């Protein structure tokens with residue numbers, strides 16, 4: 001019912017202002033949040049901020065100074081403006097829609113890459129180890145996520161990503177599979193310790209898996225575990 005598409009320049013000069021647009025299509029909505037999320041070289045996901053259905057904004061403290069997220073509802077668009085960019089802002093930028101009245105779904109755009117030529121805060125860090133893992137098909141596979149402080153298990157999510165594709169919501173609220181996910185997948189955990197399991201590894205499960213916490217602000221993502229198959 002909802003599609004998002006990011007657009008804007010692929011290249012920006014240092015100290016310039018990065019501007020991106022998110023064109024929203026599909027069905028009309030009565031609530032929710034439009035979030036900008038970017039993914040660095042190396043694949044770390046960074047939660048930037050959102051604008052709600054009532055125009056409320058939240059900005060990650062580490063950007064607070066430089067960022068604004070606005071809407072133009074008559075033309076169904078949401079905007080990202082980032083001032084004073086540097087090489088550290090080089091990333092793929094995604095917009096995403098979520099309705100907290102429906103925990104089980106999240107929509108992402110395709111993502112658009114951008115290369116570049118205030119206020120304090122705190123964050124839960126999420127560690128996924130190992131960073132890379134190989135397994136044979138048929139093996140039972142377990143990926144872990146360790147949070148530096150407790151998080152609510154209803155707000156611990158997992159994503160899958162394949163090369164040339166945006167993250168898809170894989171598990172929500174620790175143990176609930178999302179639409180599109182085979183039932184060989186499971187999840188479990190609590191407090192600071194969470195896991196994702198594949199009962200039997202299929203070839204199509206080779207992908208990157210990120211955990212994600214939106215129990216505490218700013219929401220954060222783990223560094224990811226890249227899961228590979230064995231046998232060339």
Ligand SMILES: CN[C@@H](C)Cc1ccc(O)cc1
Pocket residue numbers: 033035050098100106157214219
């Ligand atoms: C599940 N990922 C979150 C980024 C979705 C979200 C949750 C709450 C919110 O206020 C805005 C967005």
